[PDB]
Write a protein that holds these residues in place. Structure first.
Motif, PDB file in Angstrom:
ATOM      1  N   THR A  59       0.794  -1.068   0.057  1.00 33.53           N
ATOM      2  CA  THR A  59      -0.062   0.120  -0.040  1.00 33.53           C
ATOM      3  C   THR A  59       0.831   1.187  -0.126  1.00 33.53           C
ATOM      4  OG1 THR A  59      -0.201   0.233   2.449  1.00 33.53           O
ATOM      5  CG2 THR A  59      -1.878  -1.303   1.365  1.00 33.53           C
ATOM      6  N   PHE A  97      -8.906   4.203  -0.206  1.00 34.87           N
ATOM      7  CA  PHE A  97      -9.143   2.834  -0.486  1.00 34.87           C
ATOM      8  C   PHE A  97     -10.640   2.376  -0.673  1.00 34.87           C
ATOM      9  CE2 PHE A  97      -4.507   1.377  -0.148  1.00 34.87           C
ATOM     10  CZ  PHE A  97      -3.973   2.511   0.455  1.00 34.87           C
ATOM     11  N   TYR A 103      -5.255   7.629   2.679  1.00 37.34           N
ATOM     12  CA  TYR A 103      -4.038   8.094   2.718  1.00 37.34           C
ATOM     13  C   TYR A 103      -4.204   9.599   2.257  1.00 37.34           C
ATOM     14  CZ  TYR A 103      -2.028   3.410   3.376  1.00 37.34           C
ATOM     15  OH  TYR A 103      -1.626   2.057   3.940  1.00 37.34           O
ATOM     16  N   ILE A 133      -6.405  -3.412   4.729  1.00 36.99           N
ATOM     17  CA  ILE A 133      -5.248  -2.983   5.084  1.00 36.99           C
ATOM     18  C   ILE A 133      -4.700  -3.201   6.561  1.00 36.99           C
ATOM     19  CG2 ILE A 133      -4.222  -0.560   5.370  1.00 36.99           C
ATOM     20  CD1 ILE A 133      -6.925  -1.183   2.608  1.00 36.99           C
ATOM     21  N   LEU A 138      -3.350  -8.172   2.231  1.00 36.45           N
ATOM     22  CA  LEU A 138      -3.202  -7.844   0.641  1.00 36.45           C
ATOM     23  C   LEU A 138      -1.858  -8.842   0.531  1.00 36.45           C
ATOM     24  CD1 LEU A 138      -3.526  -4.129   0.232  1.00 36.45           C
ATOM     25  CD2 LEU A 138      -4.901  -5.917  -0.024  1.00 36.45           C
ATOM     26  N   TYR A 142       2.129  -6.846  -6.825  1.00 35.55           N
ATOM     27  CA  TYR A 142       2.192  -5.568  -7.585  1.00 35.55           C
ATOM     28  C   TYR A 142       1.860  -5.835  -8.935  1.00 35.55           C
ATOM     29  CZ  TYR A 142       1.592  -0.744  -6.370  1.00 35.55           C
ATOM     30  OH  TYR A 142       0.901   0.415  -6.040  1.00 35.55           O
ATOM     31  N   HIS A 166      -5.076  -3.697  -5.916  1.00 36.01           N
ATOM     32  CA  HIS A 166      -4.016  -4.442  -5.000  1.00 36.01           C
ATOM     33  C   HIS A 166      -4.724  -5.938  -4.703  1.00 36.01           C
ATOM     34  CE1 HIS A 166      -1.745  -1.093  -3.392  1.00 36.01           C
ATOM     35  NE2 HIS A 166      -2.672  -0.612  -3.063  1.00 36.01           N
ATOM     36  N   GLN A 174      -8.440  -5.046  -3.995  1.00 34.77           N
ATOM     37  CA  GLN A 174      -8.772  -3.869  -3.316  1.00 34.77           C
ATOM     38  C   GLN A 174      -8.327  -2.799  -4.127  1.00 34.77           C
ATOM     39  OE1 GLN A 174      -9.647  -3.167   0.230  1.00 34.77           O
ATOM     40  NE2 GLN A 174      -9.737  -1.182  -1.207  1.00 34.77           N
ATOM     41  N   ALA A 176      -7.393   1.325  -5.183  1.00 35.53           N
ATOM     42  CA  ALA A 176      -6.695   2.444  -4.262  1.00 35.53           C
ATOM     43  C   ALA A 176      -6.852   3.577  -5.482  1.00 35.53           C
ATOM     44  CB  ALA A 176      -5.450   1.999  -3.728  1.00 35.53           C
TER      45      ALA A 176
END
Length: 227
Positions: A59, A97, A103, A133, A138, A142, A166, A174, A176
């Protein structure tokens, strides 16, 4: 002709990354070191948790120096990132997310002597304790993504957006969503680009001799979309 910022990247450049984070009140710091070779769009970095991470390493990949992208000669006039050097630029993101927290990040990227430094503060809020998270669901890998760049003339900078997928350990994804802006630190001119994108691929690994919580990142980045 070769711009002054561009000349700073013709060889291998050492990189230092420093991050202070706080996600749902879990505070942590990370330092990273490696090198960037903009001619080949190549970044190699190793990050160490200095002060275990409260969030999955993947992440943080996007947060952890776009001045190292390979811009094809024919797109040289569209490379904002190098044109801001050495004085540097401030980068800001909000990363949403999906169905979880966000973030917000702020980085100052600039040279200190021969070293390209990425100094970052990260603040995460509204995460679910049982989510992907904070619950560490996760996978350590990548995917490849495109990153879309456009000028923000009114701000003497650029606006950037992209979506990261992710892989979750159950085979799902997931998402983002990344919203980004960059502004020069200096008062001088920068290159404001036509719309284009950066194509990324990334590989995460471990140092077999490293006992501290850490991540090794190899990344290749190439500009495209203008021909």
């Amino acid at each position: 002709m070769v711009s002054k910022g561009e000349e700073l990247f013709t060889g291998v450049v050492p990189i230092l990354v420093e991050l202070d984070g706080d996600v749902n009140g879990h505070k942590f710091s990370v330092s990273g070191e490696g090198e960037g070779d903009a001619t080949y769009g190549k970044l190699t970095l190793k990050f160490i948790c200095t002060t275990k991470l409260p969030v999955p390493w993947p992440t943080l990949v996007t947060t952890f120096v776009q001045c190292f992208a390979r811009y094809p000669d024919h797109m040289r006039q569209h490379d904002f990132f190098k044109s801001a050097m050495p004085e540097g630029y401030v980068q800001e993101r909000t990363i949403f997310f999906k169905d979880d927290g966000n973030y917000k990040t702020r980085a100052e990227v600039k040279f200190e002597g021969d070293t390209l430094v990425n100094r970052i503060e990260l603040k995460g809020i509204d995460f679910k304790e049982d989510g992907n998270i904070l619950g560490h669901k996760l996978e350590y890998n990548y995917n490849s993504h495109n990153v879309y760049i456009m000028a923000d003339k009114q701000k003497n900078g650029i606006k950037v957006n992209f979506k990261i997928r992710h892989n979750i350990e159950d085979g799902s994804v997931q998402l983002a969503d990344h919203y980004q802006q960059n502004t020069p630190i200096g008062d001088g001119p920068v290159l404001l680009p036509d719309n284009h994108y950066l194509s990324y691929q990334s590989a995460l690994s471990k140092d077999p001799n490293e006992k501290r919580d850490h991540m090794v990142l190899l990344e290749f980045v190439t500009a495209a979309g203008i021909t």
